[PDB]
Design an enzyme around this catalytic site. Structure first.
Site, PDB file in Angstrom:
ATOM      1  N   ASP A 181       9.926   4.373  -5.242  1.00 57.22           N
ATOM      2  CA  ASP A 181      10.726   3.912  -4.114  1.00 57.22           C
ATOM      3  C   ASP A 181      11.869   4.870  -3.817  1.00 57.22           C
ATOM      4  OD1 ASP A 181      10.385   0.419  -5.097  1.00 57.22           O
ATOM      5  OD2 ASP A 181       9.258   1.597  -3.589  1.00 57.22           O
ATOM      6  N   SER A 216       5.458   7.982   6.272  1.00 57.96           N
ATOM      7  CA  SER A 216       6.081   7.167   7.307  1.00 57.96           C
ATOM      8  C   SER A 216       6.421   8.018   8.541  1.00 57.96           C
ATOM      9  CB  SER A 216       7.337   6.463   6.782  1.00 57.96           C
ATOM     10  OG  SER A 216       7.692   5.378   7.640  1.00 57.96           O
ATOM     11  N   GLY A 218       5.539  11.268   8.540  1.00 57.43           N
ATOM     12  CA  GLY A 218       4.615  12.403   8.488  1.00 57.43           C
ATOM     13  C   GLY A 218       5.258  13.768   8.341  1.00 57.43           C
ATOM     14  N   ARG A 221       6.988  13.426   2.343  1.00 59.29           N
ATOM     15  CA  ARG A 221       5.913  13.413   1.373  1.00 59.29           C
ATOM     16  C   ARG A 221       4.710  14.147   1.910  1.00 59.29           C
ATOM     17  NH1 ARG A 221       6.186   6.890  -0.335  1.00 59.29           N
ATOM     18  NH2 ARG A 221       8.466   6.814  -0.592  1.00 59.29           N
ATOM     19  N   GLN A 262      11.663  16.788   3.276  1.00 55.08           N
ATOM     20  CA  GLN A 262      12.844  16.123   3.816  1.00 55.08           C
ATOM     21  C   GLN A 262      14.004  16.036   2.838  1.00 55.08           C
ATOM     22  OE1 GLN A 262      13.780  14.262   7.145  1.00 55.08           O
ATOM     23  NE2 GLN A 262      13.072  16.404   7.254  1.00 55.08           N
TER      24      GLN A 262
END
Ligand SMILES: [Mg+2]
Length: 284
Positions: A181, A216, A218, A221, A262
């Site tokens: 998470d 989420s 793109g 990750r 990110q």
């Protein structure tokens, strides 16, 4: 391995954040005019994550051609990827239309639909064999055929049917189910096993359309997956593997989609995956 010595120096000097910010400062910027049209507002999950016009994927059916997805075409590595946002409730049909039209064999998912009680992605594939999904807008049917739940990821076989022609195709869904998470995985071992499974299936090979990768947005990750796969290809292909500069490869990928990788921890994780993977593929 030269890359390992570089990794050690960056770690020892605590420079990951500074290196990452340099990448952000040097990254390309190109227009995204189509993504910003009013009629596409409800097709974008995040207002600040858009495909560039030059590399966006276009839908082919008789209607608005827009999907938040980009073609990343790595010339030297001879690999292509489609990076896309996690589908929204109203773009699941568009997502499968893309898969169909682009002739993809694999979809790679690196998130869970809900993380820490917040929606990250729509439930765009069936959870039960007996409850198939029909996308009436794009005239596609999708059925869960089989599921292999492993310790750290799941591989599903799906059947995607074009209801207009009755042609059916197998799609493999590669779902990394255990990304934490907060932060990145402690070890890249499971991520590498996952990548190898994607490779072995043929989903990344030229005999199929580009793999479709999403998280989420793109970019984060998702970026680690494409960056690690491309750098491993370059290390195995080049005459001098010590010439592979992950930072340069990432800047090249960011010419095709903004924001890939990110956080500084994702950057470090990418290096760690490439180092460990190269030790196994090429020798330690
Ligand atoms: Mg059941």
């Amino acid at each position: 391995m030269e890359m390992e010595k570089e990794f050690e120096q960056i770690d020892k000097s605590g420079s990951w954040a500074a290196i990452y910010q340099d990448i952000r400062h040097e990254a390309s910027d190109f227009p995204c005019r189509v993504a910003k049209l009013p009629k596409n507002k409800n097709r974008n999950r995040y207002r600040d994550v858009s495909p560039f016009d030059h590399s966006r994927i276009k839908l082919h059916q008789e209607d608005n051609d827009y999907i938040n997805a980009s073609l990343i075409k790595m010339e030297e590595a001879q690999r292509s990827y489609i990076l896309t946002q996690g589908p929204l409730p109203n773009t699941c049909g568009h997502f499968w239309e893309m898969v169909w039209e682009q002739k993809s064999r694999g979809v790679v998912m690196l998130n869970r639909v809900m993380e820490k009680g917040s929606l990250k992605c729509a439930q765009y594939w069936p959870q039960k064999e007996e409850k198939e999904m029909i996308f009436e807008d794009t005239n596609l049917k999708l059925t869960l055929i089989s599921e292999d739940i492993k310790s750290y990821y799941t591989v599903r076989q799906l059947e995607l049917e074009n209801l207009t022609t009755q042609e059916t195709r197998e799609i493999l869904h590669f779902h990394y189910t255990t990304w934490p998470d907060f932060g990145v995985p402690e070890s890249p071992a499971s991520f590498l096993n996952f990548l190898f499974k994607v490779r072995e299936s043929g989903s990344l090979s030229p005999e199929h359309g580009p793999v479709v990768v999403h998280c989420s947005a793109g970019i984060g990750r998702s970026g680690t997956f494409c960056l690690a796969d491309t750098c491993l290809l370059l290390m195995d292909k080049r005459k001098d593997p010590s010439s592979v500069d992950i930072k340069k490869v990432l800047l090249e990928m960011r010419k095709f989609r903004m924001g890939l990788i990110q956080t500084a921890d994702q950057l470090r994780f990418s290096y760690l995956a490439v180092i460990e993977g190269a030790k196994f593929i090429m020798g330690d």
